[PDB]
């Protein structure tokens, strides 16, 4: 019964070491999940082997949700989460910043 753009936070499971394998995470929360579409991107390109958790929600249908994939970072490679949702007129993109 309330409306809001979905919050998106992008972080790595362990602290990042170039060349060392790790996991990339995108935590999405908001209202009215409603077929929301989430992708992870390596240099603007959609990744294939992406897992997600069950979607958690409460009465008013606020929700959170996690998408992730194993990956192994470098300085050259650009990583990001991309979300598609009714409240968005276009796909929203948050970049993974290992210092932020």
**Which residues would be at the binding site for Cu ion (CB under 5 A)?**
1-2, 31
CB of 18 to Cu ion, least distance (A): 42
**Residue 64 per-residue DSSP state:** E
81 DSSP β-pair partners: 40, 94
Tell me whether residue 31 or residue 79 sits nearer to Cu ion (CB atom).
31
Tell me whether residue 63 or residue 79 sits nearer to Cu ion (CB atom).
63
CB of 36 to Cu ion, least distance (A): 14
Look at the alpha carbons of 25, 26, 29, 35 in this order and tell me if their dihedral is positive or negative.
Answer: negative
CB of 53 to Cu ion, least distance (A): 22
CB of 60 to Cu ion, least distance (A): 6
Spatial separation of the C-alpha atoms in residues 58 and 60, rounded to whole Å: 6
Tell me whether residue 1 or residue 100 sits nearer to Cu ion (CB atom).
1
Residue nearest to Cu ion (CB): 2
Spatial separation of the C-alpha atoms in residues 68 and 78, rounded to whole Å: 15
Spatial separation of the C-alpha atoms in residues 6 and 3, rounded to whole Å: 9
Count other C-beta atoms under 10 Å from residue 40's C-beta.
23
Tell me whether residue 31 or residue 67 sits nearer to Cu ion (CB atom).
31
């Amino acid at each position: 019964m309330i409306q809001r753009t979905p919050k998106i936070q992008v972080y790595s499971r362990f602290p990042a070491e170039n060349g060392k394998s790790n996991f990339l995470n995108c935590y999405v929360s908001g209202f009215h999940p409603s077929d929301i579409e989430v992708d992870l991107l390596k240099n603007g390109e959609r990744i294939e082997k992406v897992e997600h958790s069950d979607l958690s929600f409460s009465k008013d249908w606020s929700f959170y949700l996690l998408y992730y994939t194993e990956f192994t970072p470098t300085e050259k490679d650009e990583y990001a989460c991309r979300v598609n949702h009714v409240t968005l007129s276009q796909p929203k993109i948050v970049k993974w910043d290992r210092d932020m």
